[PDB]
Automatic annotation (TrEMBL):
Listed name of the protein: Anthrone monooxygenase
UniProt-listed InterPro entries: ABM_dom (IPR007138), Dimeric_a/b-barrel (IPR011008)
Organism: Saccharothrix espanaensis (strain ATCC 51144 / DSM 44229 / JCM 9112 / NBRC 15066 / NRRL 15764)
Entry keyword annotation includes Cell inner membrane: no
GO molecular function: monooxygenase activity
ABM domain segment(s): 119-212
One Pfam family this sequence matches: ABM
């Protein structure tokens, strides 16, 4: 479905955790059903994410407008909502706006697609409403050095509409390439990237990291793409 700050879309992260594989399965089947069959005025696309430990799921959903968003949230509520809080152990419907994104030059854009084999990382950052703008503006700037860390493909910075939080959405070549980058020495980190990460920590209340794999996707008026198969199994 592509990710780019220039488009006219609100970006929603329905993120879930589960205690069971039964949980991911029922969530993935329940969301794939809504994706493949649902109408939804102003809905652009949804991309279903799984998670290696087969625990918890993430729906990345592009909306034309907030009005279309709350409309769907008007049916849905108390029908499909208590089901999900029962299939899950925490629910977050994060309403954000993509404010920045870059990618490795060997990519023409950021495409999110089960036809790809990305290690999809998502991190949620809490931030005092008074500190959001600084955090967004310091984080949402071009980083050419990351473009040269192996395994890196792209990342996109999203702003929580209610001032409260910031989501990063990164794509990596493999778990090992990302684990290598995330744990490498402060030594190996250039001067400017140390200065940034050292001042950002003073503004992030909390941090929440999850890694997924894209398994389903469908844009308005287009056929779906999947690796999921009939029961929520996925490849």
């Amino acid at each position: 479905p592509v990710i780019a700050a220039n488009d006219g879309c609100l970006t929603v992260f329905n993120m879930f955790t589960t205690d069971t594989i039964d949980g991911q399965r029922e969530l993935l089947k329940e969301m794939r059903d809504i994706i493949d069959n649902g109408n939804f005025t102003g809905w652009r696309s949804s991309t279903l994410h799984a998670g290696q430990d087969e625990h918890g799921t993430a729906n990345y959903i592009q909306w034309r407008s907030l009005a279309d968003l709350e409309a769907r949230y008007a049916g849905y509520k108390n029908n499909t909502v208590p089901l999900f809080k029962q299939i899950s152990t925490s629910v977050h419907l994060l309403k954000t706006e993509v404010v920045f994104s870059q990618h490795h030059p060997d990519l023409p854009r950021i495409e999110i697609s089960p036809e790809r084999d990305d290690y999809t990382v998502i991190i949620v950052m809490d931030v005092a409403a008074q500190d959001q703008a600084a955090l967004v503006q310091v984080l949402g700037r071009p980083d050419e050095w990351i473009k040269t860390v192996p395994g890196y493909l792209s990342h996109a910075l999203c702003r929580g509409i209610d001032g409260t939080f910031v989501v990063l959405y990164a794509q990596w070549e493999s778990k090992e390439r990302y684990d290598a980058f995330h744990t490498m020495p402060e030594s190996a980190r250039p001067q400017a990237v140390r200065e940034q990460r050292a001042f950002t920590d003073t503004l992030i209340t909390a941090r929440r990291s999850n890694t997924y794999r894209v398994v389903h996707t469908r844009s308005a008026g287009s056929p779906a793409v999947s690796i999921m198969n009939q029961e929520g199994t996925w490849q």
